[PDB]
Amino acid sequence: TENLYFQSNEHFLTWGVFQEIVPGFSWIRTVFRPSERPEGRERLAVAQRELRRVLFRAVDLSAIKNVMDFGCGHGSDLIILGEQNEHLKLDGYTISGKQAEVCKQRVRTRGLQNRIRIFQRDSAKDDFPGMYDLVLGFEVAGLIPDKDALFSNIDRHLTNGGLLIMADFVANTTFSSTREQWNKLFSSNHLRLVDAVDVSNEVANCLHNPDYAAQFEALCKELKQRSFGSYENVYKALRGGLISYVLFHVQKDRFSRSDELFHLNAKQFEQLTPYAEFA
Numbered sequence: 001t002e003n004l005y006f007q008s009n010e011h012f013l014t015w016g017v018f019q020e021i022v023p024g025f026s027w028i029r030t031v032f033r034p035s036e037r038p039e040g041r042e043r044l045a046v047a048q049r050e051l052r053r054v055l056f057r058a059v060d061l062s063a064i065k066n067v068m069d070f071g072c073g074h075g076s077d078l079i080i081l082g083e084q085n086e087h088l089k090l091d092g093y094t095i096s097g098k099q100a101e102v103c104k105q106r107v108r109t110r111g112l113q114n115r116i117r118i119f120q121r122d123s124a125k126d127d128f129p130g131m132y133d134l135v136l137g138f139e140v141a142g143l144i145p146d147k148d149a150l151f152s153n154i155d156r157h158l159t160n161g162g163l164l165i166m167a168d169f170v171a172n173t174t175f176s177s178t179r180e181q182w183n184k185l186f187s188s189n190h191l192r193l194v195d196a197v198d199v200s201n202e203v204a205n206c207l208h209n210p211d212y213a214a215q216f217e218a219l220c221k222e223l224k225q226r227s228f229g230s231y232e233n234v235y236k237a238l239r240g241g242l243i244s245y246v247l248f249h250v251q252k253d254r255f256s257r258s259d260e261l262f263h264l265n266a267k268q269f270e271q272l273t274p275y276a277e278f279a
């Protein structure tokens with residue numbers, strides 16, 4: 001549903017990789033009472049950076065020129081890439097006008113306005129502005145209903161052999177896409193799944209609730225405009241294997257048969273690497 005992602009429709013807007021449960025850590029208190037306990041904010045930021053370390057595991061940024069972030073949040077991913085790699089040109093789309101304002105300000109404050117452009121545009125309806133070597137979607141695609149249009153937009157603006165990296169959910173069997181649904185989206189848009197890391201255990205550790213029942217409910221009443229009661233369902237689903245949080249590494253393959261992309265992608269979807277076994 002809508003309680004799957006860090007935010008529904010360093011300022012990262014994703015869950016993080018917690019190798020283990022941290023006693024006392026509350027993502028809810030950390031996000032909505034951030035002044036009260038500083039160590040929580042820092043632990044969460046480290047975990048969101050660890051998510052990104054794994055997401056980028058195979059990417060050689062020295063080799064890439066152009067980057068598209070199709071749901072760019074507050075622009076932190078574009079800013080970090082731009083600051084650390086002076087040759088990159090980067091574009092971001094967000095459907096939020098407020099986020100676009102923040103992104104533009106943060107880009108200019110970092111002196112990156114000559115290399116990063118931000119647009120308030122819809123990645124399923126508005127063509128990306130250029131051709132890209134690297135496309136980022138970290139907790140974005142699941143929020144976009146018209147995934148066929150999104151993946152056509154990705155394909156049409158990705159150079160052959162270009163890379164798509166995503167953080168998103170897999171339904172292991174209605175809302176999140178199953179393996180077969182993801183495979184249809186990739187295979188019908190010239191995309192091969194190269195490698196995927198399953199961080200479900202570690203995202204669940206991030207979501208672990210340290211407040212006992214009555215205390216948690218009292219906290220959520222003081223906070224009153226979200227509904228925090230449903231996040232327990234996401235935690236239970238990740239613990240039980242009903243859904244997985246997956247870090248996808250995908251390559252554009254313009255010259256392969258679509259049925260053979262599907263055949264190879266299905267095999268790769270059976271080879272997901274748990275983060276605990278990743279190195």
Ligand SMILES: C[S@@+](CC[C@H](N)C(=O)[O-])C[C@H]1O[C@@H](n2cnc3c(N)ncnc32)[C@H](O)[C@@H]1O
Binds near residue numbers: 073
């Ligand atoms: C959970 S936030 C993640 C933001 C960023 N990727 C990050 O990791 O911090 C989801 C982002 O997707 C954007 N988004 C949702 N639907 C979109 C759409 N159709 N087109 C462009 N952006 C979209 C939101 O505006 C928001 O910026």
